[PDB]
Amino acid sequence: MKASTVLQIAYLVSQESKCCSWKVGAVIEKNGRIISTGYNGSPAGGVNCCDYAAEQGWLLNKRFVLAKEHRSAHSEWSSKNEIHAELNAILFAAENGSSIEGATMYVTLSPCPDCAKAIAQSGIKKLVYCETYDKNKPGWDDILRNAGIEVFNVPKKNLNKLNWENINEFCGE
Amino acid sequence: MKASTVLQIAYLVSQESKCCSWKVGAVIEKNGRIISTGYNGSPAGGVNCCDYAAEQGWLLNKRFVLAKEHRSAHSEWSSKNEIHAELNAILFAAENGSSIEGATMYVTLSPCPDCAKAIAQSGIKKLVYCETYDKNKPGWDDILRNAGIEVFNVPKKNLNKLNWENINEFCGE
Ligand SMILES: O=C1N[C@H](O)C=CN1[C@H]1C[C@H](O)[C@@H](COP(=O)(O)O)O1
Ligand SMILES: O=C1N[C@H](O)C=CN1[C@H]1C[C@H](O)[C@@H](COP(=O)(O)O)O1
Ligand SMILES: [Zn+2]
Ligand SMILES: [Zn+2]
Ligand SMILES: [Zn+2]
Ligand SMILES: [Zn+2]
DSSP states (O other): OOHHHHHHHHHHHHTTOOOSSBOOEEEEEETTEEEEEEEOBOOTTSOOHHHHHHHHTOEEEOOEEEOGGGHHHHHHHHHHHOBOHHHHHHHHHHHHTOOOTTOEEEEEEOOOHHHHHHHHHHTOOEEEEEEOOTTOOTTTTHHHHHTTOEEEEOOGGGOOSBOGGGOOOBOBO | OOHHHHHHHHHHHHTTOOOSSBOOEEEEEETTEEEEEEEOBOOTTSOOHHHHHHHHTOEEEOOEEEOGGGHHHHHHHHHHHOBOHHHHHHHHHHHHTOOOTTOEEEEEEOOOHHHHHHHHHHTOOEEEEEEOOTTOOTTTTHHHHHTTOEEEEOOGGGOOSBOGGGOOOBOBO
């Protein structure tokens, strides 16, 4: 399917995320059909990010945003509690038994180093993203290209089938 | 994932359709992840609906709509040339080897009799749709319920993450 189409599907998927910092969505497409999806969040039996941020007082009203002064505390907690969108999409394929070899991954946000190295080793041959992650540095995609993975970008401006008024991505103050 | 979310994903999927009468999208979800998708269209090596309608003069400008006087000619051609969204989603699972047993199907439009009977026999246990197909009659879903399939409806009004200005469903005059 068209890149703009799947990317926007990844954006709808991201809305299911309970993370108070960023809402990320990932879609795995094989031969034109979606065979897996994922969004960033905690595992089973684990408290959701938004609920934990509430208890910790990391949020600020108007509709809650993660306070800049607490983003650091969120990153530390998230690193060891929230599975990223890309990995969740891949994890479901392993758990369900769906081969993603040769597939294409669409993700709302450019993958962090942990996700990039996993993607490079997953069998995925193409990665398409929209926004560039907050904490990413230049050349972050080298590991993907060296693995033989094509990396493409589609700007938000080409995505006009979504009512952006109701799509939340970055949720920090 | 939330019904409203997957239904809207089915709507984005429907935009890939080249049919001049209706744009239909179907999504198969298993344990919360999308494992298959489909939209109505011709098979490989087969001329697309919009292109065939153009040659036949079935269309009317403003952005082309299927003329009411030609919908009958379209239905006859479509019946033997276009695979419906629901069946395409199921066909890919059979071709790719992805079990849809116990899965849930989301489809923009209520399935026609051909699709309903196939769904009833597919192993799918839940069907969620948005709009009621033009040519459907009451009790059309009995075959699904008798097969033990739950049937739910979500009105368009609950779907507000899409910019409906850019989503085409019914394309007739
Ligand atoms: O799931 C993805 N995909 C990309 O690889 C990067 C981060 N995200 C995540 C993890 C976390 O929930 C959030 C980033 O928030 P922080 O930047 O505050 O750690 O988005
Ligand atoms: O794919 C689906 N899913 C539902 O079962 C019903 C019809 N559709 C199709 C087939 C055809 O392309 C179109 C209906 O157009 P007509 O009503 O003009 O035949 O939508
Ligand atoms: Zn979080
Ligand atoms: Zn990551
Ligand atoms: Zn058609
Ligand atoms: Zn049908």
